[PDB]
């Protein structure tokens, strides 16, 4: 069974831990607790072409709380940069995350995920978001609270890592 390491990078309070917990247990988390260091959560998706497992390294987005910040990216085979559409500082900090993420692992597939799209008011409008085009990334609007596209980035990443472009999640 394939086993790909995935590093979840993003600013603080963006929803990375909430997104991982929603993928694991299936229930939304209300409170905000800063992710101390890194947490490794195994994740499995059942697809038509077999079984695929993910090692999602949920990293700290706060500087003072981060551990081996860049060191958490060694031997990574995957990545997701999560930014908040309700706060423009996260999107402005997105280029820094990509910059220090491609320094360690170069040719991995990276996905930019805009979180908290469920709310009407969003300080990062769709037009403002163009970093995916500049760096050939994939941008999937997701919402942990709403489960809008919470499975799409994993499906795209699995398609690119495994090789199959017709691979689909059957369960």
């Amino acid at each position: 069974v394939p086993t790909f390491k995935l590093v979840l990078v993003g600013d603080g309070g963006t929803g990375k831990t909430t997104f991982v917990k929603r993928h694991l247990t299936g229930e939304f988390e209300k409170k905000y607790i800063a992710t101390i260091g890194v947490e490794v959560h195994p994740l499995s998706f059942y697809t038509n072409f077999g079984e695929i497992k993910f090692d999602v390294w949920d990293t700290a987005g706060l500087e003072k709380f981060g551990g081996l910040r860049d060191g958490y990216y060694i031997n990574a085979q995957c990545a997701i940069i999560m930014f908040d559409v309700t706060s423009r500082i996260t999107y402005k900090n997105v280029p820094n995350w990509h910059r220090d993420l491609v320094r360690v692992c170069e040719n991995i597939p990276i996905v930019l995920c805009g979180n908290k799209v469920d709310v009407k008011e969003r300080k990062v409008k769709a037009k403002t978001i163009t970093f995916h085009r500049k760096k050939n990334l994939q941008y999937y609007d997701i919402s942990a609270k709403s489960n809008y596209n919470f499975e799409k980035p994993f499906l795209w990443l699995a398609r690119k890592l495994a090789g199959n472009p017709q691979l689909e999640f059957v369960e």
Binding site: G37, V38, V40, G67, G71, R103, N136, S146
Partner: protein, 1160 residues
Amino acid sequence: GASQIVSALDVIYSPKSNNSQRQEAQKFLDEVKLCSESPFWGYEIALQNPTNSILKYFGLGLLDHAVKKNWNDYDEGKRVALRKWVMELNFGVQDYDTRYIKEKLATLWVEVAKRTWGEALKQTNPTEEQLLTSWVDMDNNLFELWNINQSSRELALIIFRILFEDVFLLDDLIVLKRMTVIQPLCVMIVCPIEVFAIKYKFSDKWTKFKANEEGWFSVWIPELNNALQQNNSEYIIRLLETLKTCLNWPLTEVIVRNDVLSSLLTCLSSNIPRAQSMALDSIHILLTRPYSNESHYQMTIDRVFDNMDLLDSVYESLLFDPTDDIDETKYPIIKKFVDMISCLYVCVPKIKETNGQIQKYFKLVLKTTYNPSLIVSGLTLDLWCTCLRNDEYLPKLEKYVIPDLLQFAADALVYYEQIDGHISKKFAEIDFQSKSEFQTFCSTYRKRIRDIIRLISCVELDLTYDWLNNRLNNYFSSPFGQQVLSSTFLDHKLEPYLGALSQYMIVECFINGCIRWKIWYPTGDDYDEKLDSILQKLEILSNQLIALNLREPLLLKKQIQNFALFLTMLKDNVLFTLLEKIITSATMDYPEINLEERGAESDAVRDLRYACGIELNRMALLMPESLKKIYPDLESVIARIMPNLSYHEKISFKSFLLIIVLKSSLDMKEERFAAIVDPELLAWSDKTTVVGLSDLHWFMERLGIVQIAEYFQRRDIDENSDLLSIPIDDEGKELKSELTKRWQSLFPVRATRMFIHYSMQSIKTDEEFKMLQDLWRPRIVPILPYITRLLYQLQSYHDPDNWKGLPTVVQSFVKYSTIERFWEAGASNKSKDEFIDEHMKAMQTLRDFADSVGHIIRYTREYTLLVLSAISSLGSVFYLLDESPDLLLNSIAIFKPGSNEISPGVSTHGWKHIMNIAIRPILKGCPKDCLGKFMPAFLPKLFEILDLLLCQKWSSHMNDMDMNPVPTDDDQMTEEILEENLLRQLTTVVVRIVIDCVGQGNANPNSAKSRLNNHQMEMRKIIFNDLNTLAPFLKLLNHLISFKDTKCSFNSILVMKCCLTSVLNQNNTVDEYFTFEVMKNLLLNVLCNSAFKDSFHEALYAFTVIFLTLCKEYPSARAFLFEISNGYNIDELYRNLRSVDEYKTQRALMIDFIDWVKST
């Protein structure tokens, strides 16, 4: 010990370790990092064992932390030792080092350079000690690293890339402090000394820093050329990565001297994908960079344009067949190439065309526009639009590409998302995240294509007209054209209909192009003859198009749409013909089907008739005087048509006649107006309707709920039985048709709205405005009570307490009708498709019956709100009568007898609609001579109603969230998200109402230069100088800032700043209530809450202003502020503020008080 660090790294990196063990290892590593020997330990770790890549990276990270955080604490000797350690580690790079190890070493070198390089250059003739401190030998050492080995070569390239990126591309803080020394040093190291001295004038102390006299470009560019000949892909990629960041800033003489553009073009002619992408980025950077020397820019644009054949070959090589699968390796390269090509049209007016460079460039752009991908194709549409709009390119563009571009744009005007197996969807499923995004991008693409067609038809009207005539003849002689002409109903999502629709859109674009030509062409002596010829051509085209005898309703609708554009240009010449054609096309029998069953093909005929009516109204508005000559014939024809016309189209036709009556200066306006309006408005004053509108059971019976109960009993339906599973019956269809007909005839809201709005559109001067206002007065003031009563009943329908009088068998029916099914993208995992699927499934179900009843109720409420808004536009007649404010407001807001609940059962969306449609237009619709009689009787209750409604809605939302923490299912999450969004929008509407009633006071605390309008200024006199209106107004303002919404609270505080000038008018009653409430609300719920970050800063300035004013004139405020603070020294705090003139220092004093209150 190093063994502990190795064990901790193994624990934190192994996947089998649990999270707690990982956290313990990370804590140990963190406490290791804080040790005073961390830099030396990291250097030793990196040097001793290069085999362990992870441990070496950890040591380099320790060095990075030492050089990034503890740099200021280190003395000169420690800094020099750290620099020496970094240099030694960089010089020790071997082949076994991974890429990230090299990147980290380069990062260390760049950090040390940014924090050391150029320090001694700010002092005259610095000694050797200062030069050594300032790292004078950087260039010499960096060149030494360039020759150690090929791994050191890659390391030096990475060092240069990171250094230049941080210095120029990125807004790094450290370099920003010392930009004026770092940047010229980079220019020194990359440029030759002779070239540098031309632009810069510094002395030999700068030349000491530069080691290689010839510069660094004279090293990179020959190396890049050698790598290109040897076809070394990795070396080429690394060099282009380094070279890409060092071309915007350096002196252009270096770029020209080394022939960088030639090397970039050579890289582009290679088959390496990454090299091609970086060459594209480099070429775009060279094109868009600033040029001090215009000659160098001329050479650049000349060499780029002289290699159009090479660019065409590169594009052809990049192309691929997407039928099987798109190539992700070069599709982004294709997009980048088309983006770069689209930016070259700016330079076109500067290329001296000698070998047809401009023709080849435009041919290449057109070829790229033919790309199957819409994203790739849509990049050049802006280029084509800009080129067609401007005149610098028009003579150079018409000669080569105008016919081909027109043909492409005509061929590309198709519905991509509705074509099965279209080649564009293959790229759509990769460039777009959802089908809705693809559909809206297709809509934008077709809009830009239509813009292209319109501009071409304007510029080249003769050629475009000839081509369009030939194309239309060929299409309508084709078998698809025969199918379109010889059919009555076509599948509206199939090729025969879509092709003809595209043809009609092309015709519309051509007519719009002629309209544009009417202004674009210069007003010379030849203007009149050309305009006459164009009018003759358009009349011939219109006659040709009409003679087709098109029968498809949804396509004849588009023909009627184009009729208005034809009439705009041709004026009277075809006015009667188009009018007669529109009239006769709205009464076609269509014997094949019957229109009363609400079929799929009946909706097309209904839409066609509605479009015919609306176009009749538009034509009457445009040319009323010309219709006066033929009015009696029109009146007779319409009166003959009236029995064979539906009520909706009856109202449309009557409005058309009314427009002709009013605008065309016809005699006896009053008699015709009465004969047209009174029969339609008579239903409002019906005695049975008047007496029964005050009884809710009568309202239910008229709505038909009793008949629904009888039908349910006949079908043996029960409350316990689910309505979502019971199949529907055709008897129910007949019943709902009868009920909706009787309902629309019973309450002529549409007739009143249309008549009032279109009579308002007939106003051109004030005198006939006054006479029309007097004319509408007898028809409105006896009808307004009944409209308000209808709105009352529509509000009372949503109250659950009013349903218990109904029969038990329809208790659930009204509840199902009340709820709405609005959907949002992002508020649920479902998309639009399955939501519309749920709605479609219910059609054959009895639940759709309740849904239709609720839709009827909501439609009637929307139209009565629109009628009330239109009556506001009637002017002084709606505001001078004394009963209007109470009559409207009591109707909209139903206070329950005992409990204070604003119209129980009315959703937040309904309140949003009520506010937006009625309250805002009426509040802004008050004439400046009528505020003094309507405002003081409206606002005092209106603000109370708004405050109560907002408080109740917000309290209900938070209570439901708190007492129901975990949702039962995801549907509960969707409902909560929708409710929160609607409540936020309602609060936004309320704060907009407040803003337009008073007017805010700017974001800057000291700026109040926003000039309030006359309407805004007038209200402030009424509100602030009246206790009856003022006191409720602060309640709304106090609540608005308290509510958890950043946008309104920030805006409300800005409004309060504009109010603080006048609300504190020394009034005793105003001042006291301001004391206990506003300080309690602002300090405890806004200042002490972190959810109002931006609002906290603005409220703090407002709070400080109130604090100084109240404490100065009211000692009780100081005692009150002492109590809520539970300590502190208000008198000392007040004295410190007054002695400080700067607001920044005053803000610091308040932050201490607010923080201290937070602790207490």
